[PDB]
Amino acid sequence: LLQALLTVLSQVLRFMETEWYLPLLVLSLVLGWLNLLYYTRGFQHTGIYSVMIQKVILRDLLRFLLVYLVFLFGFAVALVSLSREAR
Amino acid sequence: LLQALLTVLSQVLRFMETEWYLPLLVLSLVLGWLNLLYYTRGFQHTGIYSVMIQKVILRDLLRFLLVYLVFLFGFAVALVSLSREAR
Ligand SMILES: NCCOB(c1ccccc1)c1ccccc1
Ligand SMILES: NCCOB(c1ccccc1)c1ccccc1
Numbered sequence: 001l002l003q004a005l006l007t008v009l010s011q012v013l014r015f016m017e018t019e020w021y022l023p024l025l026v027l028s029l030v031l032g033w034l035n036l037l038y039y040t041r042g043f044q045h046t047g048i049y050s051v052m053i054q055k056v057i058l059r060d061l062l063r064f065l066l067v068y069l070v071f072l073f074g075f076a077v078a079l080v081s082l083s084r085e086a087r
Numbered sequence: 088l089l090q091a092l093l094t095v096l097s098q099v100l101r102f103m104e105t106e107w108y109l110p111l112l113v114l115s116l117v118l119g120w121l122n123l124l125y126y127t128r129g130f131q132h133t134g135i136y137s138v139m140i141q142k143v144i145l146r147d148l149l150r151f152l153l154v155y156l157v158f159l160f161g162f163a164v165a166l167v168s169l170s171r172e173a174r
Binding site for chain 2: 063070071074075077078081082085
């Protein structure tokens with residue numbers, strides 16, 4: 001659905017000649033290629049292999065990102081404030 | 088306690104206009120953000136996940152650091168003495 005919405009939006013933006021049509025077109029291209037895993041389930045070779053990604057792999061990747069991004073922000077604000085003074 | 092002590096010290100230093108108040112203020116900001124894990128225990132979602140850090144994760148990270156830092160010093164002194172002579 002997202003790939004379809006962005007593609008429709010990108011083509012709508014291209015009609016209005018706004019420069020932001022290209023980023024949406026490129027994001028649609030990235031999402032569309034990633035959507036090709038949906039058709040791996042049609043073959044026993046690729047279907048069984050791609051089972052153990054959504055169950056465990058994809059879930060725990062989100063867990064690290066949320067915790068890490070919070071303290072990435074905490075250190076980023078710390079470094080900028082401390083580095084504002086020159087020698 | 089450390090975050091409170093450094094924050095009090097940093098504000099005390101700021102009254103005396105010493106430049107070292109900023110590093111203590113920034114260290115307090117880093118520690119204060121890290122103290123936010125204490126409130127993860129209030130939710131079942133985050134409480135159970137954050138259990139397996141203090142028991143095993145944090146302890147063994149200290150083990151590597153103490154052993155590695157000793158021989159980091161040993162190689163550092165070795166490299167400087169050996170690199171003192173130019174070609
Ligand atoms: N040369 C075709 C190999 O096919 B795959 C495959 C073949 C037999 C059994 C299981 C998998 C495959 C390749 C990449 C990713 C996932 C599966
Ligand atoms: N979108 C909320 C996800 O919540 B977390 C979560 C949800 C259900 C079960 C276990 C944990 C979570 C996220 C990051 C780190 C730790 C836990």
